[PDB]
Design a binder for this molecule. Sequence first.
Ligand SMILES: Nc1ncnc2c1ncn2[C@@H]1O[C@H](COP(=O)(O)OP(=O)(O)OP(=O)(O)O)[C@@H](O)[C@H]1O
Ligand SMILES: Nc1ncnc2c1ncn2[C@@H]1O[C@H](COP(=O)(O)OP(=O)(O)OP(=O)(O)O)[C@@H](O)[C@H]1O
Ligand SMILES: [Mg+2]
Lengths: 243, 376
Amino acid sequence: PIRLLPWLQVVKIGGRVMDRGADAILPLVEELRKLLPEHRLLILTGAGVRARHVFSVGLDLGLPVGSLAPLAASEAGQNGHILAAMLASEGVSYVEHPTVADQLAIHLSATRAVVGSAFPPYHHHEFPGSRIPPHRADTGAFLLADAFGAAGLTIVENVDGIYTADPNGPDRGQARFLPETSATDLAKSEGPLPVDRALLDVMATARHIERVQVVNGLVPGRLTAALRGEHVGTLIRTGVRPA
Amino acid sequence: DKIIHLTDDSFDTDVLKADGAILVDFWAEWCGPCKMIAPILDEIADEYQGKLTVAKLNIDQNPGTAPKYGIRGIPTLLLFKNGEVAATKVGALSKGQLKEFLDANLEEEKRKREEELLMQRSLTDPQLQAAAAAAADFRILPDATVIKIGGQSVIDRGRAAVYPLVDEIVAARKNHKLLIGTGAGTRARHLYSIAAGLGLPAGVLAQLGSSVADQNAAMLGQLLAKHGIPVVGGAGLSAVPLSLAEVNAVVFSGMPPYKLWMRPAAEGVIPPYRTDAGCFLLAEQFGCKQMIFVKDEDGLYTANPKTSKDATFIPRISVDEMKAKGLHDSILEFPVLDLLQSAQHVREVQVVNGLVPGNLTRALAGEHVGTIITAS
Ligand SMILES: Nc1ncnc2c1ncn2[C@@H]1O[C@H](COP(=O)(O)OP(=O)(O)OP(=O)(O)O)[C@@H](O)[C@H]1O
Ligand SMILES: Nc1ncnc2c1ncn2[C@@H]1O[C@H](COP(=O)(O)OP(=O)(O)OP(=O)(O)O)[C@@H](O)[C@H]1O
Ligand SMILES: [Mg+2]
């Protein structure tokens, strides 16, 4: 399988990072600004806390998973409009799912970076089993990053990376940092992760992307570093054998 | 212990001016049924840490408070919510009967803490995932049924296959509410072969296949237009409610909207989720009555009957029984059976021979003809 846009750098901004407002966003916008003359970025944005509120209302109404996914996905679309507005003076705009899928090469020939929703357009066709949509922001970013045969995917979280337990949870003392992991190893272990369990499932079927680094967007320089292959967070091996 | 020993004076600041639910025991050392509930009561104090606060008021030491609330029995448990008596429980209770009472009153409080958990904890967390599964199940179109009109199996054949099925559809429509989905076929097989030839990913192939399924929906929907049955899409299905209500049927394109975000297969660039998956998940999402796959064979056989001199027909089979038989080629895409097991609304599918007259009408009326693939 051919790499469609091999020069592409896919960067996913966590929804919970957006939720932090001006304190997290303003520095990140400067980091992103300084990155434009270095990389040809596709900046995909997560949903965060509003998706939870749409879930709490949606589930209280008894709505199925396929109803909740578009709703959740809409929130990611809004953080995208926010981020793109901050980068508008740099010629950056939020672009919709049909435009990402078909006209990305033109949009990236026109500008240095474009913002899009991280979430995939599964809509009604989301998978059952769980009342919570499985194919979320991290999953949607990876499926798209691997589809385009891009140079890489970088997840921008509000934590240093993946830990043995939630670092902001009750057992935070018994949580230790993981500099490296396998998608297989994380899938086997049960409990919470800063990434979707669906992302690890889709990484098993990956074609091009070998590692996905999870980095702290609240620390300026991390994203810049990760994009240069510098190990500044958790590297997740996908299980795509090199040459 | 977490149990607070109250006094006549302390009752204003410890009970009335205290936030959150409080359970107060109006007890006395002489009272037999008190001596019985007392160990049960300091036990629930720990079992209900942060949920409820237990309080005790010995009447013999504090005799003022009891007559204020009309306490004419011992023990009497009063559940205080913001300085007002919410619920009362006079007499002795068992361990289980006390929880039964507390829970039936603290439902709104439990709902509020579960909501808080759904907004603080990660979506990957198992406790959050388990609490969500416990939510209510709503069926959007429950009296509706989803039908797949095969691309290669029927639409690619043309008039001889399509025209009779249209007649069955226009008629059945009077009694049942139908969501008619289309397949793709040989034009999609050709695109796949060309695209694969170039090494294009499944995401790209998925978009190609989608168009053939759109053409078939446009062709099928044209023969039904005189009957008022419309063709739907737009990735939102905004037109489906009105059409199902008024004309009782719609024609949609069976392809999932995944496009470039299509999950690839284990190996190869053929999209694993095609029109069988697109149709099934639309039946699963709306919470439809049944899911019927209209094909060119009586149902499932031991092997492909087009490439088998003698194959045994299977009228009823489960997905586990199918996987265990190891099907070389199935009547339906392998991932549809994996989705059928995970399904919440459509816990079985039916395959019928649309080339045989009446098969659709008979399957629609509920009568089992062809193969029924059950989830468990
Ligand atoms: N094993 C873990 N390692 C690291 N963080 C964890 C782990 N388990 C849970 N967490 C929690 O996950 C949080 C990240 O939240 P989450 O992944 O829901 O947000 P997001 O990625 O910004 O959102 P979105 O899915 O909308 O893009 C961290 O702040 C941390 O509290
Ligand atoms: N064991 C089997 N039993 C019955 N039919 C089988 C079996 N193995 C293979 N088949 C064949 O599998 C085919 C499944 O249907 P078909 O290929 O027409 O898909 P379709 O509904 O047109 O979908 P698409 O849009 O992907 O083309 C049938 O033509 C059938 O003859
Ligand atoms: Mg995350």
